[model samples]
Target chain A: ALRWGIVSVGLISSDFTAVLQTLPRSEHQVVAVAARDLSRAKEFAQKHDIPKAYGSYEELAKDPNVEVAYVGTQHPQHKAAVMLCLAAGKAVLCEKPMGVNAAEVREMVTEARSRGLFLMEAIWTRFFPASEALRSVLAQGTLGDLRVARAEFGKNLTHVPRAVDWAQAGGALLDLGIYCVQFISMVFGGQKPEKISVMGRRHETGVDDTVTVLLQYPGEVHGSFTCSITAQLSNTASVSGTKGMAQLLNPCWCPTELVVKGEHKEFLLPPVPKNCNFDNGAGMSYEAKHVRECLRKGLKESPVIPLVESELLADILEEVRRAIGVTFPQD
Target chain B: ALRWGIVSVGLISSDFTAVLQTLPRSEHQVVAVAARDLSRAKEFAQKHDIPKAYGSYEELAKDPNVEVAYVGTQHPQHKAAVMLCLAAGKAVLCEKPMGVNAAEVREMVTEARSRGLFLMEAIWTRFFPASEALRSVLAQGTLGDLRVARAEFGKNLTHVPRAVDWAQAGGALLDLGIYCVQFISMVFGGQKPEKISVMGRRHETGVDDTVTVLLQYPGEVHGSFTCSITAQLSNTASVSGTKGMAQLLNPCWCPTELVVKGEHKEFLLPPVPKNCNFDNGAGMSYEAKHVRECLRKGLKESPVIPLVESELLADILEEVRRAIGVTFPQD
Candidate 1:
C-alpha cells in the first residue's frame, strides 16, 4: 500500500484526496493532512476520512505512516512544503509550477536529488489516457515531422481570489499557462525553444492577465500559445506536422477526447464525486496510481514526467515571466 | 456601367472575371484584357469573351473605353500596374497586397491621392455577408470588450510556383498571412498594434514558409495568427471578448459560416462555375459589386476597406516581414 500525506486543505488538495479515496484503499490511502490552521486541517481530514490532521506541514512530514506527501499549496508555499517533506524522508508529489521561480524549484530539486527521494510535479493531465494516446500517435510517425504545436487555455478567473492576488503569485502564465507551455514541451519531447517571443498585458495587480507567446525551436519547429485570465478561450490544443495533425478538444489541459487523423477517441473518466471542485476531478486517480507504481519499482522520479522535464518547464516559465515582467517576491 | 479593364490573365484574374461575367452586364462589363504576352492576352480574351486583348499593360491603361482597371498580377507587378492605370486617368482595383512592401503601397496610395482617382485593394472576404454580420455583432457589444482575436491560414502551398520563389516575393506572411493579418486589422477597425513579435521558418528559397505572429494593440487587446506553406491548419478565425465570443468557420479567409454567441448563421455562395479555379470562386462577385458601388459613388477608396486601412495592413505585413527576415527585390 502507498500511504499518502496531503499538505494543504485547499480546494485542489481536497479534490485530490477525494479522488484518491475512490481508489482501492489497499493500494492507495490518504493517511494524513496538514494546514496552517489545525481547525482547517481537522475539518479537511474529517471530511476525507484521513487518519491524522496536523497544524503545520512539518508535523505531517514527520508522520512515519505517511510514505509520500502531496504538496497542494499555492505557488508561493510549494517550495517550503516540498522541501520539508523531502528532508523528512518522504517521497513528494508537488503540484504544478513546483515553485514561484526556477531558483526555488532548483532548491527543491537539489534537496530531493541529494536525499535520494522520490519527487515529481503533479501535472495530472500528463497521466490521462488521452494524453498517452496523443503521444503514442506522434511516436508512430502518424503525424510525421512535427512542425507546429498550438495551445490555448483561458477563462474568466477573476472571480477566484488566488487567481487575481499577486501575493499568491497569481498570473495567467503560471496558474493557467503552465499547462499550455507543458503541452507544447510535451509535443516536442522537452526540447527547449531556440527563441521565445512574448507579448502580454499586465493586470492592475502587476500580474500578467493576458499573454501570447511564440517559440521557435531547432529544425524550425514553432510553438505558439495564448493564455488569459480576463477572457474565455476555446481551451483547445493541436499539433500539426508534415503528414497530418492531432487535436485535443476543449479543456485541453485535462482532455478527455483526442482526434488524430480525423478519428476521434474518447478516454472517459470515472464518475465525478459530489465534492469534486473542478472539471475532470476524477481524473487525478491516474497520477495517483502511476505514483504508486513508480514507488513500487524503487524509482525516485516519474518516467512519464521526469524531474529533468520539470526543471526545463520551470526554466521556460521563468523566462516567459521575465519577458512579460511578471515578478514575485521570491524572484 | 463600370467598364473594367482586366490586367494580367493569371488564375486570380481569371476567377475574378469569371465571377464578374455572371453579374448583370449593364452594371459591369469587361472592356479589355492585358498581359505581358499578346498571345496570352488574346487567348484569355477569346476564352472569357471580352471585346479587346492588349499586348502590354500600357495599351490597356491608354484605352479610353475602359473606365476602371483591375490589376490582378503577382505582388511584384502590382505597383507598376496600379500606378500606370491611375496615371492614365482610370480608377484602379488592385489585388490584395497592393504592393510588395509598405513603401510601394504608400507610393501607390500617394499617386491615387494626387490624381483623386478611385483605388481599393481587393480583400473579397470583407464584402461577404458574414463579415458584415461579424462587424455588426461586435458593434452591438454582444461579446463585450474585445480581448483577443486569432486567425490561422495554412496549407501545403509548396506545390505552387509563386509560393516558393523568392524572386516572386513568395513567403507565407505576404501570400497567406496577408489574409490573416487583414482579418486581424478588420476586427480591430484598422487600429495599428503597439508592439509586434514574429517567429518563422524559411524555405530553401530563403522565403519564410511558416510564420507565427503576435500583435499587442493599444488597449492591451491582442491579435495572434499563424501562416504556413509547410503545413495544413484549421484555417479558422475567432474574436473573443469578456462576455462571449464569435468564430468564423473553416476557411476563415472566405468564410461561408459564422457562429455568433452560439447561433450558427451561414452565408451561402452563388453556384460556382465549371471554369472557376478556387474554392468560393463565385464569391468574387461580392467584391466586384462593391467595387462598382465605390466607383458609382465617386469614392476615392472603398468605404469598407479604405486606403488608410490598406496602408495599415501593408505596414503590419512589412513589420512582420522585417522581423522574420523575408525580403524582396523591390525592398
Candidate 2:
C-alpha cells in the first residue's frame, strides 16, 4: 500500500481523514499527521485513530513509512509545506490554490520536476469519473466545437469577515472563483484564454468581493464566469457548442448528473459513485486514489490533474488577480 | 362590420389582409387599398378581392365606407399616413417601430389626440393570449419582484444587403431587437428603465448589426438584451425574481409554452391561439381587434396597448440608439 502523511490537522484535514477511512481495500492509508502543537497532532490522531502523530510538519515529512504527503494548509503555507516534503524525498499532493500565486506554484513544480517526484494540486474535481466522462465525450465530438462555456461558484461569504480580507487570500476569485476558470479550461481541452476582461466590486481590503470575467479563446470561443462572496448564485456550469449543450446539474466542484441536449434529444448521465465521507467532504478519497495510482505506475504527475494544467490555471488566476487588483498579505 | 382601408399595398399590408379574410363570418373586410401607382393599387385590390382601389393615399383616407385605416408603409411614411387618416376622421392602427424615432411618434400621438380619433401601434405580440396570461401571472406576484430579465433575438440578415443599410433601419436592433425591449417593458408593467448602457458592433454603413444592452430599473431589477444580424440564436427570454422564475420554451415573440418554476411547484401555462392564416410569418392579430374595439367604445387608445406604454418603449429605444451611436440616414 502507498502510505500517506498529512501535514496539517486543521478542520479540513480532519474532514479529509474521515473520507480516507471510507476507501475500501484501497492502495492508500493515512500513516501520519502533523500539527504545530503536539497536543493538536495527538488529538487529531486519536480522533481519526491514526497510528502516528508528529508535532512538527518536517518530522512527518521525514517519516520513512509515509511515501506521499498531503499538504493541507492555507494558501500562504502551501509553498513551504510542499517544499519541505519535496526536500525529504516524499511525493506530495497539495490542496488547491496550490500556492498563493503563480511564482509559488512554479517553485514547487520545478523542485518536483528536478527531483522526479510525484506532485499534484489536490483539485479533486479533476479526478472525478464524471469529469473523465465529459472529457471523453468532448474528444469524441459529442457536442461539436465548443463555442461558449459558463460556470459560476458563489455563496454568501460575507458572513465570514475574513472572506473579504486580502491578507487572508480572501475574496471570491481565489476562494471560489478558480473552480469556474479551471472548469472551462478542462472543458475546452486545456486551451488557454487569449484575452480576459473583468468587472467587479472591490472590498475595503482592495480585494474583489464580486467579479465577472469574460475570457476569449481561439475561434470565437468565449467563457463567461461570475464569482461573488456577497450574493448567492445558482452555482452551475454549462458548455454550449454548435451541435449541442451540456449542463452540470449542481456546483461543478462535485460530481452530479450531466444533462445533455442535442439535436432533438435530451437525456441525463447517471451520477458517478458518491463518496459521501464528509470528513473531508466528497471527492478527497478519489484524489488520494489517483495519487496512489500515478505513483504505482511511476508517473511524475497525474494525467487526470497534470502539472502543466495546474501551472496554466495558476497563470490564469494571477492574470485575473492583477486585473481585479487582488494582493495577498505575502505579496 | 368594420370596414378597413389599407394605406399601402406592401408586403405587411398584403399579409394582414390575408389574416382579415380568415375571421369567421367576415366581421372585418378590406374595403379599399391605395398605392403610389394606380395600376399597382388596382392589381393589389383585385388580387386580395377588395372592393375598391385608390390612386393615392389621400383618396383612400377620404372614403366614407372605410371606418379604420391600417398604415402599413415603411417607417418614414408612418406619420404622414396616420395624419391623413386622422384628418379624414378615420381611426388607425400603424405598424411598429411605430415611427422611426420618438419625435415622429409624439407628432402622431398629438394629431390623434386633437382629432379625437383612435390610434395604436400594432405591436401585436403584446396582445396575444399567451402574453395576456403571462401579464396576469406577473400582476399576481407569482414570480415576486423581478430581479433580472434576459432576452436575445438573432438571425443571419447579412444576405439581405439592406440589412447593413442605415437608411432602411435594417439592423437587428430596430428590425428584430425591439421585440425584446418591448417584452421587458410589458413584463415590468410599463415601468420605464432608469438607466441604460449599450454596446454594439457597427457595420461599414454605420448601422449596428449586433448590440448588447443593459437596463437598470428602480427596484434593483436589471434586464440584459442581445441582438445580432450575423448569427442565429435560441431567441429565448426569461425572467427571474426573488420567489420564482418564468421562461418561454420557444422564441419570445410567438405563442409558446410558459413554464413557471416557483419555490413550491412547477406549472405550465397553456399555449396562446396561433394566427393560422399566414404560415408563421404574420404577427398576432389581437392588437388590431383591440384598436377596433377601442374605437367602437369611443376611446382614444386601447387600454392594453396604451399610448403611455408606446411612449415608454420609444423613449427607451431613443436612449439605446443614442448610446449605440446608431444614426439613420434621415438623421
Candidate 3:
C-alpha cells in the first residue's frame, strides 16, 4: 500500500482524500492529514480516521510514514505547498492548472524534476473512462485524419467570490478554460500549432471571465473552443475527421457518452458506471490509480499525461493570457 | 407590381425565379430572363411562363418592363452583369456574394449608390424567419447580454468541380464560410470587431478548402466559426448570454428550429412548413418579399442588410482571404 499524506486540507483535499479512501487496503492508505491550523488538521484526520494529524506543513512533510503528498489549495498557494512537499523528498500530486501562471508552473516542474520525484497534475477528467474511449477510437482510425476539434467549458460562477477575484488568480481559463486547452492539446498531440488566436473578457477584479481561442495545426487541423464563467455553456466537445466525427455529449469534461457521426448512421457509446462515488471529485480514483502505478514502475511522470504535454498546455495558456492581457500578481 | 428581370438564367437564377413565382402577383413579377445563350434564356422563360426572353444581358437590361434585375451569374461574371443592370437605370438584387472579390464588390456598390439605384445583396439568410426570430429575441433581452457566439458550416463537396476551381473564385470561405461569417455579423451588429483572425488550408488549385475564423467584439463578445469542403459538420450555431443561451439546431444555415436554454428550462420555437419550397434555394421568398417592400418604400438600400454591413462583410472576407492566401484572377 502507498502511504499518502493530505496537505492543506481544503475542500478539494477532502475529495481527493475520499478518492484515496475508496481504494483497497493494498492500493492506497492515508497516513496523515495536515494544515497550518492544528484544529483543521485534527478535524480532517478525525473524520477520515487517519493515524496522524500535523499542525504545520513541516510536520507532515517530515513524516517517515508518508510517501506521497497531495496538495489541494487555491491556485495562488499551489506553488508554495508543492515545493515544500518536494523538498521533503515526497512525491506530489497538485491540482489542475498545476500553478496559477506558467512562471509558477515552470518553477514547480523544475524543482520536482531536479529532485527526481514523481509528479502529476491531478486533472481528473483526463483519466475518465470516456477519455479512454475517445483515445481508443482515434487509435483505431474511427475518426480518420481529424480536421477540426471544438469544445466549450462555461458556467455562471460569478456568485462564487474566487471565480472573479484577481488576488485569488481567478479566471475562467485557470479554473475552467484549462480543460478546453488541454483537450485540444491532447487531440493534436505530437504536432505544434502553427497559429494561435485568443479573445476574452475580464472581471472588475482584473481576471478573465470569458475566453475564446483558435488553434491551427499543420495538417489542416483547426481547433475552436470557448470557456467562460458568465454562463452555463453547452459543455460539449467534438472532433471531425475526413471519414467521420466523434462528439462528446454535453458536460463533455466528465462525459459519460460519446456520439460518432458517419455517412451511414450515428453511433453512441455509453460510459460504464464510475469507479468512485464522491460528489466533490467524482471519478478521481482513476487518477489516483494511475499515480500509484507510476510510482511502482519507478516513473517520474504519468505516461497518459507526460510532462511535455503539460509544458505545451502551460505555454498555450501563457499565450492566451498574453493575448487578452490577463496577468497574476506572481507573474 | 414590380417587374423583375432574371439575369444569366443559370441554376441559381432559376432558384430565385422560382422563389419570386411563389410570391403574390402584386409583390414581384418575373417579366424577362436573359442569358448569353439564347436557347438557355428561352427554355427558362418558357418553363416559368415569362412574357419575354432575351439573348444578351444588354437586351434584358434595357427592357421597358424590367424594373429590377436579379444577377445570378457565376462569381466571375457578377461584376459585369450588375454594372450592366445599374447602367441601364434599373434597380438590382444581386446574389449573396456581389462579386468574386472585395474589389469587384466595391465597384458594384459604388456604381449602384452613385446611380441612386435600389440595391441589396441576396443574403437571403438575414431574411429567413429564424433570423428575425433571433433578432427579436435579442432585442427583447431573452438571452441577456450575449458573450459568445459560434457556428459551423461544413460539407463534403470536394468532388464538386467548382468547389476547388480557382478561376471560379470557388472556396469554402466564399461558398460556405460566408453564411457563418454573415451569421456572426448579424448576431453582433452595430459594433465593429476589435480583432479578426483566420487560419485555413488551401487546395492545390489555390482556393481555400478549409477555414476557421475568430471575431472579437468590443464588449468581450467573441464569435468563432469553421467552414470546410472536406467534412459534413454539425452545421449548428449558438449564442451564449449571461441569462441564457440561444442555439440554432443542426443545419443552422437555414435554421428551422431554435432552442433557447435559460437558467430554469428550455424553450423551443418550431418552424413552419417550407416557405419557398425549392431544393436549390429553400427560403429566398422572404428576401424577395423584403426587396419588394424596400423598393416600394423608395429606399436605396435595405435597412435589414444595410450597405454599410455589406461593405464590412466584404472587408472581413478580404482579410480572411488574404490570411489564407486565396487570391482571384481579378485580384
Provide the TM-score of chain A alone for each candidate, in the order shown: 0.98, 0.92, 0.93
Could you tell me which residue pairs clash in candidate 2? A15-A279, A15-A280, A16-A279, A16-A280
How far is B21's C-alpha from truth in model 2 (Å)? 8.6
Q: Tell me the tens digit of each residue's lDDT in model 3 across B87-120.
A: 9999999886777777778888899899999888
- Over 4 Å off in model 3, which ranges? A262-280, B262-280
Give the C-alpha lDDT of model 2.
Answer: 0.74
Which is better, 2 or 3, measured by lDDT?
A: 3
Which window of 10 residues has the lowest lDDT sum in candidate 2 chain B?
B262-271
Give one digit per residue, the lDDT tens place, for model 2 in B39-60.
9999999888998999899999
> Which candidate leads the pack in DockQ?
1
**Residue range A54-78, candidate 3, lDDT tens digits:** 9988888899899999888888888
On TM-score, the stronger of 1 and 3 is 1
Position A136, candidate 2: lDDT: 69
| Recovered fraction of real interface contacts per model | 0.51, 0.00, 0.47
- How much is B83 displaced in model 2, in angstroms? 9.2
Instruction: List candidate 1 stretches off by more than 4 Å.
Output: A272-275, B272-275
